[PDB]
Every structure is written in C-alpha cells, then in structure tokens.
Ligand binder design. Sequence first.
Ligand SMILES: O=C(NC/C=C/[C@H]1O[C@@H](Sc2ccncc2)[C@H](O)[C@@H]1O)c1cc([N+](=O)[O-])cc(O)c1O
Ligand SMILES: [Mg+2]
Length: 213
Amino acid sequence: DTKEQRILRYVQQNAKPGDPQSVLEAIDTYCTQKEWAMNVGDAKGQIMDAVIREYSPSLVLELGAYCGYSAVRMARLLQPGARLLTMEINPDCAAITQQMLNFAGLQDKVTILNGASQDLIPQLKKKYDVDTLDMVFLDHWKDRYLPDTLLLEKCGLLRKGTVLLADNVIVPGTPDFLAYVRGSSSFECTHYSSYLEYMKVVDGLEKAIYQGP
Ligand SMILES: O=C(NC/C=C/[C@H]1O[C@@H](Sc2ccncc2)[C@H](O)[C@@H]1O)c1cc([N+](=O)[O-])cc(O)c1O
Ligand SMILES: [Mg+2]
C-alpha cells in the first residue's frame, strides 16, 4: 500500500461519485488530517479556479498529474468541448489520476500522457491534434519548469496570450524559471501569494519521569 493508493481509496469510500467538488474535499481532508501530500491544496486551488474562470481556456496542458487533484480542479471548470492534457512520468501516478478522474466523472475532458514531459512535448501537435495551448499548469519537478517552458516555445506550442501558471515558486522554489520569466520581455508576470498545502504539522513533547534503577 502506497500513500497515493490510500488517497484514492479514501476518495472512493467517502466522496460522492460524479461530484468533483466532493472528490477535492475528500483529498483535502485526508491530506490535512492523515498524511501530507504534494497536492496544490484548497488555498492555491482557489487562485487556480479564479484564473481558469478568467481565461476560459479551451486547451490546457498540465505538467505533473500526481494524484489528479489539480486535473479534477481544472477539468471541473472547463467549458463543454474544452480539453485538459496532463503529462505524468510515473505510471503509478498516471493510474491513480485516471481513476480519480473516472470517479469524479471528468474522464471525457482529460487525456493522460504517460511519459516524461521532455519526450512528450515534441509529440503533442502530431499525436494529440494540438495547435497552440491556451494555458499551461506547471507543478512537476521544479528543475523542469524552465527547460520545459523553453521546449514549449521551441515546439511552437505558445501563442500570444498563452497563460503559464506555476506552482511552488516560493517553496520549494523554482528559481531559474522565476528569474527567467520575470526577466524576459516575452512574458508578463503576476505573483499570487498564498500558502503551502497542508502545513498544520503535529509535534509534541514527551514527559518521562525517572523512577530509579
Ligand atoms: O516536489 C513537488 N512536486 C513534484 C511533482 C511531481 C509530479 O509530477 C511527476 S514528475 C514529472 C517529470 C516529467 N514529466 C512529467 C512529470 C511526479 O511523478 C509527480 O506526479 C512538490 C513539493 C512540495 N513540497 O513542499 O515539498 C510541494 C509541492 O506543491 C510540490 O508540487
Ligand atoms: Mg506543487
């Protein structure tokens, strides 16, 4: 049993099928109370929701699926006909994400790509009938944000107005990506300050009273 399997099982057991909000809430309860996990969480999630609603993207690319928390969060706000493509290098994570999406009833809107982003990005247009992306959500390995952004550009996947939205730019941090975008006339940047997910960290004091030998 892995932590990610335990999250999925908790959702199947407690959340309402076909109800994306319920799924998100079940994931957030489990990770808040039982086991920390690197889902974006509800605080940053609300910012994502606001951005998605602003831009109403027809084609979104997610880098890093993990347990599918963000895929559920985004796909539930997509308009009819819109699509989310999500890249995930770990087959166990890809499997969990697909079951999460299935449970939430969002499977028709989302396509899971199994592989490393650096290998998949160049295949997007031909294999998945993509012209340019409306939005990209970055939340995979932090050292991949910058090289993948450069690859997206190279592959002709960015248009004027494509919205990149990156998690964890403060903690754990993405310093090369953040410096790059903030310094580049090719990007207009805005920072949305929030909180790292699930940080009510339990610790305690042990009192041990010596009784003699
Ligand atoms: O490390 C973090 N995220 C990495 C996530 C990685 C996800 O994406 C792929 S990697 C990949 C590679 C190539 N192509 C696709 C996916 C992994 O298999 C996992 O599904 C992280 C860490 C913390 N934290 O506090 O430690 C907080 C967070 O919010 C985080 O997102
Ligand atoms: Mg993250």
